[PDB]
Amino acid sequence: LLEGTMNLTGETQSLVEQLTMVKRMQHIPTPLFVLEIWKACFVGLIESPEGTEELKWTAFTFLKIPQVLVKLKKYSDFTEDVNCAFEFLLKLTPLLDKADQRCNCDCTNFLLQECGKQG
Amino acid sequence: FLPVMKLFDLLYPEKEYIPVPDINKPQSTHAFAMTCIWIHLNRKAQNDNSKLQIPIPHSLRLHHEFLQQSLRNKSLQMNDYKIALLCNAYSTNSECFTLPMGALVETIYGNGIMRIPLPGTNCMASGSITPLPMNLLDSLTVHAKMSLIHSIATRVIKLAHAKSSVALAPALVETYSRLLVYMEIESLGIKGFISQLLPTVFKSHAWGILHTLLEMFSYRMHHIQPHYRVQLLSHLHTLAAVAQTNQNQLHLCVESTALRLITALGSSEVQPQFTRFLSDPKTVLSAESEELNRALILTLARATHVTDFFTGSDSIQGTWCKDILQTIMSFTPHNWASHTLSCFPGPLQAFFKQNNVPQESRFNLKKNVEEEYRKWKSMSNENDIITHFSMQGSPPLFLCLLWKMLLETDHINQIGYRVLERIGARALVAHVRTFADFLVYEFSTSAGGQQLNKCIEILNDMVWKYNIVTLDRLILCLAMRSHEGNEAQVCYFIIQLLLLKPNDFRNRVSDFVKENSPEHWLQNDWHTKHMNYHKKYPEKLYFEGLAEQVDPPVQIQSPYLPIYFGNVCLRFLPVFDIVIHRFLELLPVSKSLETLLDHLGGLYKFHDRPVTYLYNTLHYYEMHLRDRAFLKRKLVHAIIGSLKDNRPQGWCLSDTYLKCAMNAREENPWVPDDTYYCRLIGRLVDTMAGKSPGPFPNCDWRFNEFPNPAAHALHVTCVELMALAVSGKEVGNALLNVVLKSQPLVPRENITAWMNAIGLIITALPEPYWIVLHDRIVSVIS
DSSP, X not given: XXXXXXXXXXXXXXXXXXHHHHHHHTTOOHHHHHHHHHHHHHHHHHSSOSSHHHHHHHHHHHHSHHHHHHHHHHHXXXXXXXXXXXXXXXXXXXXXXXXXXXXXXXXXXXXXXXXXXXX | XXXXXXXXXXXXXXXXXXXXXXXXXXXXXXXTHHHHHHHHHHXXXXXXXXXXXXXXXXXXXXXXXXXXXXXXXXXXXTTSXXXXXXXXXXXXXXXXXXXXXXXXXXXXXXXXXXXXXXXXXXXXXXXXXXXXXXXXXXXXXXXXXXXXXXXXXXXXXXXXXXXXXXXXXXXXXXXXXXXXXXXTSTTTTHHHIIIIIHHHHHHHTOSSHHHHHHHHXXXXXXXXXXXXXXXHHHHHHHHHTSSOOOSHHHHHHHHHHHHHHHHTXXXXXXXXXXXXXXXXXXXXXXXXXXHHHHHHHHHHHHXXXXXXXXXXXXXXXXXXXXXXXXXXXXXXXXXXXXXXXXXXXXXXXXXXXXXOOOOOOHHHHHHHHHHHHHHHTTSOOHHHHHHHTTSXXXXXXXXXXXXXXXXXXOOOOHHHHHHHHHHOTTTHHHHHHHHHHHHHHHHHSOOOSHHHHHHHHHHHIIIXXXXXXXXXXXXXXXXXXXXXXXXXXXXXXXXXXXXXXXXXHHHHHHHHHHHOXXXXXTOTTHHHHHHHHHHHSOOOOSSHHHHTTSSSOOOOOOOOOOOSSOOHHHHHHHHHHHHHHHHHHSSTTHHHHHHHHTTSXXXXXXXXXXXXXXXXXXXXXXXXXXXXXXXXXXXXXXXHHHTTSSSOTTSSOOHHHHHHTSSOOOSOOOOOOHHHHHHHHHHHHHHHHOOSSOSSOOOOTTSSSOSSHHHHHHXXXXXXXXXXXXXXXXXXXXXXXXXXXXXXXXXXXXXXXXXXHHHHHHHHSOHHHHXXXXXXXXXXXX
16 A cells, blocks of 8 residues: 555566565465455555546556566466455455445456456 | 632733623623622622732722622613623622512512403403513523522412412513523422422412413423423322312313323333332322323333334233233223224233223113103203212213203203213213213214214314313313224214314414414513413303303303413314324224314424324334325325424425425335435434534424434434335335445445444334344345
8 A cells, every 4th residue: 555655656576575575474375465466456446535646546556466466477376376366355245346336337347357468 | 719819810811901891792791790700709708808808900890890880770671781780799698689689570570560361250460471581591690590589489489378369470480481491490490399389389279379380381391300200290199189179170281281291201211210100000090080091001002112122022921011000900991992902012912802891882871871861851850950960970971961952952951051060070081981982882873964064063062162171182082982993983083073074173273373383482472472362262161151051041250260371272282193193093094184184284383292293103003004105195294384484494304305205196206216315314423413503403402302403303314214105124125225235425434323323213113124134134144
């Protein structure tokens, strides 16, 4: 959450060397890691107030999260665990349904085609 | 009070003299208060002035000289607030307070200035009709007020015990009703009045002070504590058993007070208040009259099914309800109907399978009255027919004697006039009970036609042309008929024709709703409008209308009681409520309630608690009113439009309710989105915390039926929520889809108050509204 606030203009490697190191310090399951990776992207989308900050937060959650995950796949098994991560993720019904009132549509289709575009 | 001048220095550090501003504001006494504090410190320095006097301050000595000039002044009234200055700067004096006291006590007590004729004969009430206003009641000190109370008590003790012809002024009874609400004086208020003033009035044996106190307790009080309520209930039971209360007005006023406080009860205080008088359950019950005990039983019934205390059990044993009803069944046998049993709680229905007297036979009921009908004319002497037809213990059959006279002659002789006044109003309830049984049994087998309209008009002849009783008692006796099927519908149609075929009572209701308003405390000339209303309709309460039709000339000229606030319509509105309840208890008398509501909706202009009554009416018949849609829509067409003017704009209803609810049905009710319900929850949650503008208008919550705006908002929200045509099944779905599904207009970091309001709403909701939560929890647990 701190990265997309104001210091979101940097490169893709500072956040990588932060969050991957965080997994070193505290025992974190990789499906739980991807679960947090996507729920933070959803929360930064919905909980951003309306205005230019909404657009900035949605762009931050849409355009830099494939960049870190491509590098994570390059450096690391990463296909099987994200399935159980989405098994965790597809239960958060009311909070993510509140996002669909603001977004008037199903963002899940767009993001699961974006992941296919990223391969 | 030692360091208070240092409290001066932190509060009022100045050097320049204080000028004297205009006195006309009531808040100026607040500004002039510290000068009175200094002169009352000099009043403290009246005794033992040799020890540590204080010099006069430089700034405040100008206003001290001003109040000294006011002491030299010899004129004080409502022109300025020097009345308050001379009542507050000299309240702790021995004779400096008597100078404004002489002006005050001769201007509101009515010290023989004028003798206004009240309705009736020989009623010379005192002259002054303008009481102490609201701003005057708050501009005095507490000690000045209690000294005024002591002076008033010393006046009224020697007035009541001498039974003097000098009555009490309407101004002073208005002030007496206004002062007792203040709980700062409550230690010497009604707690100090039922301890001191009321025992002295009881020792006086005056019968006029008691009647006026009952008048200002029924139609002038708004918030009496339940312990004080049952204390006064015990006091009136001790009063009515003695002091020969055979007069019609003495029984009628205590009946209109007891039924008022019975109808003023809620649903949550039934359990804690009963164990206070569980030691003496017999004396808080009616031993001779079925009406009060049946009203208390229905009060119990609406206090249990609404609060849903009966669920999880199906018996009265082991609870607090068995022994009180065991005391109820003694000396007052009363039957019960199955349709009335339908809305009763389950344990209550189980207990009503026993200790239930059946009905008396119709054929013998007519046979006996016809057997002594010919004994009326076997010999037509005065004294024998007077004595034989009127001892206490005779079967009450006299109204059919009168009716058989007025079916074909329309004349009541000296015997009929003497018997009715010899029986007295204490046995008149038991008489009119059996007479209502005659009425329902006679119209059950009656043939329609010219007699159907003739009988209701010759019955109105007793209502307004003979003036035998107040209209409320007979209609309430007809309301408590516990018959099955056809006779209940017939009695409901008796009341249906009784309320609309004669126009005299409807003319009085129209006159009172057009010429009077419920805001009695703000109405300074309420006495004048009451005199005009009683001069338009001469209220005859001692068989005066019955007197002039007697074949020998017999008239009554007994002096009337001092009446200031009593009328037929306010005494009939609780009966108008209980008949509405009886109508809604039965199905095929539905649409007859529809034509009455739009006809007689003005009386609810003067209802003590209409919102709670309508909420309980719509809640208790939840299994009786959901099926009948237009009957449920009819209620908002009449009562809301009555009190939409005196109560300010937006007091009860919402905007979309004004757009679509009271519109007539079109086979397409507006099924709302969830945002409509979110609007109501947002209305409730803001009114719980309270706002200075407020979505709901501010009012004098001392003189309302709610001490707080939150209780006012909860009741109207509960009224509007479950008044839709949809049953209690989709209401829970909408309430949950507000919160269980996502919703616009509902924000987070506040949702705790929203769900608290929803929980209070759904606990206030009837059984099928929250029984669907079990079906909801089955799905999510599976």
